[PDB]
Amino acid sequence: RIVQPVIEQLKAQSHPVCHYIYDLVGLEHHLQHITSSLPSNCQMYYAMKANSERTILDTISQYVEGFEVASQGEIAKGLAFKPANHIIFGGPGKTDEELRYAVSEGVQRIHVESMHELQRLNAILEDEDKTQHILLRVNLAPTQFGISEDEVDDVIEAALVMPNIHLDGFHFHSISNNLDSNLHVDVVKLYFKKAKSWSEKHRFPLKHINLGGGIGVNYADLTSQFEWDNFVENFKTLIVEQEMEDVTLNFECGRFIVAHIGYYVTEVLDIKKVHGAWYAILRGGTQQFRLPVSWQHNHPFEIYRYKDNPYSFEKVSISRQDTTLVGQLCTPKDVFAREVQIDAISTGDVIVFKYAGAYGWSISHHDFLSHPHPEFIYLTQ
Amino acid sequence: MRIVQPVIEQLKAQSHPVCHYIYDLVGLEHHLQHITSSLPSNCQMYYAMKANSERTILDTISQYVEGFEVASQGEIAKGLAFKPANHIIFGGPGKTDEELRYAVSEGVQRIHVESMHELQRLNAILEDEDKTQHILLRVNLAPTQFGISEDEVDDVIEAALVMPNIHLDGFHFHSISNNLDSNLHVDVVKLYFKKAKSWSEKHRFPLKHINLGGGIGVNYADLTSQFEWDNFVENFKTLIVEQEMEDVTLNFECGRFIVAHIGYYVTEVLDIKKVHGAWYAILRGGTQQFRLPVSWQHNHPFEIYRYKDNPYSFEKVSISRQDTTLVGQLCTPKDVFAREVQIDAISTGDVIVFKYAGAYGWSISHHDFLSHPHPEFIYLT
Ligand SMILES: *Cc1c(COP(=O)(O)O)cnc(C)c1O
Ligand SMILES: *Cc1c(COP(=O)(O)O)cnc(C)c1O
Numbered sequence A: 001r002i003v004q005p006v007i008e009q010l011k012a013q014s015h016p017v018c019h020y021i022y023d024l025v026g027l028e029h030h031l032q033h034i035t036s037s038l039p040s041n042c043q044m045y046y047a048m049k050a051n052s053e054r055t056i057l058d059t060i061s062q063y064v065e066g067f068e069v070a071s072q073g074e075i076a077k078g079l080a081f082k083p084a085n086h087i088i089f090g091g092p093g094k095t096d097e098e099l100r101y102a103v104s105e106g107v108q109r110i111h112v113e114s115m116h117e118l119q120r121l122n123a124i125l126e127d128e129d130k131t132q133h134i135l136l137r138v139n140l141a142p143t144q145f146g147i148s149e150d151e152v153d154d155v156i157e158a159a160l161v162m163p164n165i166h167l168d169g170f171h172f173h174s175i176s177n178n179l180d181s182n183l184h185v186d187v188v189k190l191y192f193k194k195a196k197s198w199s200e201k202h203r204f205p206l207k208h209i210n211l212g213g214g215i216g217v218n219y220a221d222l223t224s225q226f227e228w229d230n231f232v233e234n235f236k237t238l239i240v241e242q243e244m245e246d247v248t249l250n251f252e253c254g255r256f257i258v259a260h261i262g263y264y265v266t267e268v269l270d271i272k273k274v275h276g277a278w279y280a281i282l283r284g285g286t287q288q289f290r291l292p293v294s295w296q297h298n299h300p301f302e303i304y305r306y307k308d309n310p311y312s313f314e315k316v317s318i319s320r321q322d323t324t325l326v327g328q329l330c331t332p333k334d335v336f337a338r339e340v341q342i343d344a345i346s347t348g349d350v351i352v353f354k355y356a357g358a359y360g361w362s363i364s365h366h367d368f369l370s371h372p373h374p375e376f377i378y379l380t381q
Numbered sequence B: 001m002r003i004v005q006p007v008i009e010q011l012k013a014q015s016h017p018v019c020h021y022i023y024d025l026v027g028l029e030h031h032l033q034h035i036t037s038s039l040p041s042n043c044q045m046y047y048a049m050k051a052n053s054e055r056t057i058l059d060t061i062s063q064y065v066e067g068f069e070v071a072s073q074g075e076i077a078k079g080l081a082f083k084p085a086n087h088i089i090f091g092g093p094g095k096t097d098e099e100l101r102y103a104v105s106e107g108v109q110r111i112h113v114e115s116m117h118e119l120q121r122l123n124a125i126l127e128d129e130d131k132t133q134h135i136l137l138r139v140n141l142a143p144t145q146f147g148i149s150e151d152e153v154d155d156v157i158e159a160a161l162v163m164p165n166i167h168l169d170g171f172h173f174h175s176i177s178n179n180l181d182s183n184l185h186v187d188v189v190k191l192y193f194k195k196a197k198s199w200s201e202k203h204r205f206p207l208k209h210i211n212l213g214g215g216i217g218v219n220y221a222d223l224t225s226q227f228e229w230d231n232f233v234e235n236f237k238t239l240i241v242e243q244e245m246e247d248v249t250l251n252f253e254c255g256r257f258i259v260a261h262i263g264y265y266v267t268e269v270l271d272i273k274k275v276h277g278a279w280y281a282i283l284r285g286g287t288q289q290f291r292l293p294v295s296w297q298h299n300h301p302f303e304i305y306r307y308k309d310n311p312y313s314f315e316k317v318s319i320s321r322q323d324t325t326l327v328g329q330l331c332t333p334k335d336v337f338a339r340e341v342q343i344d345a346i347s348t349g350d351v352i353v354f355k356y357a358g359a360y361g362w363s364i365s366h367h368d369f370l371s372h373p374h375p376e377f378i379y380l381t
Helices: A004-012 A024-037 A054-061 A072-079 A096-105 A115-128 A149-161 A181-202 A228-241 A255-261 A291-295 B005-013 B025-038 B055-062 B073-080 B097-106 B116-129 B150-162 B182-203 B229-242 B256-262 B292-296
Strands: A018-023 A042-047 A066-069 A087-089 A109-112 A132-139 A165-171 A208-210 A248-253 A262-274 A277-282 A301-304 A317-326 A335-346 A350-353 A375-379 B019-024 B043-048 B067-070 B088-090 B110-113 B133-140 B166-172 B209-211 B249-254 B263-275 B278-283 B302-305 B318-327 B336-347 B351-354 B376-380
Touching: A004 A018, A004 A350, A018 A024, A024 A042, A024 A054, A024 A228, A024 A255, A024 A375, A042 A054, A042 A255, A054 A072, A054 A255, A054 A375, A066 A072, A072 A087, A072 A096, A087 A096, A096 A115, A109 A115, A109 A208, A115 A132, A115 A149, A115 A165, A115 B263, A132 A149, A132 A208, A149 A165, A149 A181, A165 A181, A181 A208, A181 A228, A248 A255, A255 A262, A262 A335, A262 B116, A277 A335, A291 A335, A301 A335, B005 B019, B019 B025, B025 B055, B025 B229, B025 B256, B025 B376, B055 B073, B055 B256, B067 B073, B073 B088, B073 B097, B088 B097, B097 B116, B110 B116, B110 B209, B116 B133, B116 B150, B116 B166, B133 B150, B133 B209, B150 B166, B150 B182, B166 B182, B182 B209, B182 B229, B249 B256, B256 B263, B263 B336, B278 B336, B292 B336, B302 B336
Parallel strands: A018 A375, A042 A066, A042 A248, A066 A087, A087 A109, A109 A132, A132 A165, A165 A208, A208 A248, A277 A317, B019 B376, B043 B067, B043 B249, B067 B088, B088 B110, B110 B133, B133 B166, B166 B209, B209 B249, B278 B318
Antiparallel strands: A018 A262, A262 A277, A262 A350, A301 A350, A317 A335, B019 B263, B263 B278, B263 B351, B302 B351, B318 B336
């Protein structure tokens, strides 16, 4: 167990247990595997919205080609660990301030999501007397993202008449949390066919395709994860099959890169029965780890049993009960897991929520009810 | 929009991008004056600061209320800037040893105790510090994680009464959230009275105080049909007399009803686009700054400020009389303020004025997701 030595040290020093713990060794091994496996014309970028903690970005920047970013704040964070010319910038509502900032820093690509954005970017580029390499984000045939497939032709033609714009190709991000590697190869096939078709029709060279992220992780069954080696094998073949060896490619994964190496670890403060149902109240809450509520699932956990008793009255101990795990918050929505069968649990024990590395802290309402933040520990050996 | 229009016009005239929380403190004071002055002499109004704990809001509210209701060490600290500890009352299902010791050290007015285990942890701290503490027992009437299951209340009363460091004042009830029915709220209070009197008579301790909770509702669907406060108060006063509660001190602890109608979230339109037949308007900011609509899964009420001028050399994007989905800048399809709502006219550069944004707006939101700059805050006086 990676987190158990840390929990024992915290218990030994009488420190409260409410922590995010990250396995950086596991992260580096995962990254090494991913990046070394790809074909030479495809690179991994990290989509930092999954987890933009500075220590996480620092570890990740050693392996990835660069960062995908979607705001001025994320550009700023990326610039601490990568040069601007390895930062790619997406998002449906890029402000004039963000675009000017991106242009000024010299970001690698801006992924343009609409005609109006193209025109706003262009006006800035004319005012600054600079050029910019772009992709056009395509929404293949409804969400708010990218250019609707049938509108794409018009935005290509507008882009090609702008001398300040260098059109590299296309950007597709149309799927989320896909666990099926064969499906993902078929989706990449579709992206190749559409990009080649627009390139031909509009008579401009297809230099680059951003294939997006959306590679899934399994929170229900932890043993059944995305078949990366299978995917990459069939991906390499597909590139030859479609004659894309000359076209440069990138992925922009968030979740798949960091999910399994993070843990949210908290101590049991209380155990109570209310109208027949058992509850375990934990330190912290869903305002520090909102992932379970966002998904409406029971988040995977293990229990560390603590033998000692810090009080002169007895613990509350139960066994073999359907138990609802909640945090400290004053809302009935503060639930990590609802009516999960628990083998044995007492006040003073520690819950270890696994697979908490992605969209855990990053999506959470940290300061609701003004609780102190959890402590952050990054394991390096 | 009468209140915020002058601000929007100044922001536009000065070339400041519009993404702001705006609060009407004159409206807040008038509202508080009316509520607190209408209560009978034995009832007090506390402000439940989780609704909005912004320092300027607390500054303004502190004049008019008896005190603050708080649910963490952080909220106690924030309350202590404008009230003494003995006008702060402390609730919540997971009060840590650290929070209890801080509450006791500062001398908080009441701790609203939610379990036997908390009672014992509080009592150990009081024996160690040689202090006494006034408490209420939070009752969960006949489920949720909050308070003491009705069946278990007798046992906790008897335990509290034999602990000499504990002063049991009475009971705390908070069941209802967002009730717009004033008559029903009177009937709920009547239940609280009868239950509290029964336990007092059974165990023969003086019924000194009852905390009646918050949960006075606000109408986000129809803004013209708000809680009939004056009706509630008249019947509440009558009920006190009928139930012979004149010598029992009472308190409410309201959040939402106090601050909801005085706050606005206002933001410029960055882009309008059609994606596979569906119209979207993309706003500056996002549901990470104003999560209320997503948390509730409703369409939040708004109005449109129609801005006359154009900063660009190209035409605005405009639509008329379409089902339109309002989204922010975030790179998630869940970033939705309002789904397929009628908009009579809207253009890029217009400002959407989200009304009733004062309670559980900024306070519940995941401020730093995607690392966007915070909205600006303006307090009107
Ligand atoms: C959310 C997002 C990603 C990352 O998605 P994961 O599911 O975390 O891999 C990549 N690109 C874009 C444009 C996104 O919006
Ligand atoms: C949420 C809450 C309140 C305030 O609720 P509103 O609906 O904002 O009035 C008061 N007391 C307790 C114990 C709460 O959890």
